[PDB]
Each structure stands twice: as C-alpha cells, then as structure tokens.
Design a protein around this ligand. Structure first.
Ligand SMILES: *[C@@H]1O[C@H](CO)[C@@H](O)[C@H](O[C@H]2O[C@@H](C)[C@@H](O)[C@@H](O)[C@@H]2O)[C@H]1NC(C)=O
Lengths: 124, 135
C-alpha cells in the first residue's frame, strides 16, 4: 500500500509526498504488474526533483519494465535531456536494449530528440 | 483511484489538471489503467509492417521475401535457402547424400528408413524430397 502510494506520488509529481513516503519506509524499487518502478514513472513524466531524490534513496537506475524499457529509455523517448544526463551520472546503461532490441538512443531518434540521441551517442 | 478510470490508448497523468493523457506518437496502451505507454515495434528494410501500430495496439511484422521470421512475433529474420539446402554458418550449403530438405528453411533431415516399419523404398529420395515407402 505504501509502494502503490509512492508510484502515484512520483506520477502526480508531488515532491514532498514522495519524501514523506520514502522517510516512512516505502520500497523505492516498487514494481507494479507492468514492472514500472517510481524512477520509470518520474523519468516518463520529467519530474527531475523526484528522479534525484529516488536515486539518492537507492533506486535501481537500470530497472527493466515487463517489455524491457529502463528509466533512461523513457527519459530518452519523452525528451527529458536533464533527467537523461542525471541518470547517466547515476550509472545508467546507455547501450541497454528493450525486448524489441532498441537502445534509448533509438527511442530518442524515434521521438525526434536528436539533441538527446547525440548526448547518448557521445557517452559510449 | 484516479488512474483505474483511464482507458486503453491512454496513460495516467495528474500533473496538468487532466486525469489521463493520450499515448504519444509511436507508443500504445493495450490495457486501461497503464502508468506508461509501451513503445511501437518499428519495421523497415528486411522487416515488413503487416499490422500498423495504433494508440491502443502494437504493430506486428513479417520479413520481406527471400527471408523468414524466427522466434515469437517475428523477433529476428533468417535468410531463405533453396529446397535441398540448409543454412550453415558458411551460408546456404546443399544437403549431404542420405539427407533432404523439402522446405526453404531449417536443417537437412535424413531420408526415412522404410526397413524400420517393414516397408521397401517404393520411390528413391533426393536433396529436395524424402523417400516414398511401399510394401
Ligand atoms: C534408386 O537408385 C538406383 C540407382 O542410383 C536405382 O538402380 C534404383 O532403381 C532400380 O533398382 C533396381 C534394383 C531395380 O529394382 C529397378 O527396377 C529399379 O529401377 C532406384 N530405386 C528405385 C525404387 O527407383
């Protein structure tokens, strides 16, 4: 129930509600049925503030969803350059594939984020 | 509570006064109540798009002529060989003497031993086709 509340907190973008729920001993790596962690959700919706605090509370940076997508894949696809950069600094797997064998660099290119794709291509 | 109400073709989103948003281009949600939209399979060159991606359903794909799908949902493509060939690492090699392949994919298999069932070779085999057993 604390895990479910933390996913919603991360999704909605409620910085203080995440901090409280983490400090109340919520699982920072709480998957749903689709294998989606708080970090995936925060990465998907561009909540840098929350991405930083989840990582600082020991989030798995290379957590895979049910279809093999990582927080870097989501950040890359959704055009969130600063979150992409922060995840890389936190040791994100830059050449990681999903089920369909596509890197974050591929997803960045797919969504027409060449700027971000270039950042990911320079880093290994 | 506010995400359960989200349909397919859509993801849960409470940042900007909307309850749910539509799946962005080249992504889809096949269930409702999804926190994130899954990414569309892309298919060009060797891969040919059979079903196009929708907001609510993934693209499906086959391989272009001269190739064939391998693995669930055509994960990767493999080169077709001729009949009476198999695909070695060196490439499309013809079948050895006592062995045949009636398909344009897979390994050479040995001819049927008619003796096993008691029968006799009615028609001889070849690289292209198996023995026909008789009496
Ligand atoms: C399979 O190949 C043989 C030559 O490579 C050929 O001689 C066989 O046919 C003949 O066999 C002899 C013993 C005789 O039965 C004759 O009537 C056949 O034509 C061939 N086997 C068959 C069944 O065609």
């Amino acid at each position: 129930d604390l895990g479910k509340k933390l996913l919603k907190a991360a999704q909605e973008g409620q910085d203080d509600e995440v901090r409280e729920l983490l400090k109340a001993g919520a699982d920072v790596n709480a998957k749903d049925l689709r294998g989606i962690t708080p970090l995936h959700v925060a990465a998907w919706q561009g909540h840098l503030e929350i991405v930083e605090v989840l990582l600082k509370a020991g989030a798995d940076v290379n957590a895979k969803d049910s279809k093999g997508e990582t927080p870097l894949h989501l950040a890359a696809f959704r055009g969130h350059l600063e979150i992409v950069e922060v995840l890389l600094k936190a040791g994100a797997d830059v050449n990681a594939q999903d089920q369909q064998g596509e890197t974050p660099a591929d997803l960045a290119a797919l969504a027409g984020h060449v700027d971000i794709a270039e950042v990911l291509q320079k880093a290994a | 509570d506010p995400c359960s109400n989200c349909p397919a073709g859509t993801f849960c989103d409470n940042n900007r006064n909307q309850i749910c948003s539509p799946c962005p281009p080249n992504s889809f949600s096949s269930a409702g109540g999804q926190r994130t939209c899954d990414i569309c399979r892309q298919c060009k060159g060797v891969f040919r798009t059979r079903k196009e991606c929708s907001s609510t359903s993934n693209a499906e794909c086959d391989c272009t002529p001269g190739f064939h799908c391998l693995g669930a949902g055509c994960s990767m493509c493999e080169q077709d060989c001729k009949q009476g060939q198999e695909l070695t690492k060196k490439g499309c090699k013809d079948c050895c003497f006592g062995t045949f392949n009636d398909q344009k994919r897979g390994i050479c298999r040995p001819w049927t031993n008619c003796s096993l069932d008691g029968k006799s070779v009615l028609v001889n085999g070849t690289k292209e086709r198996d023995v026909v057993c008789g009496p």
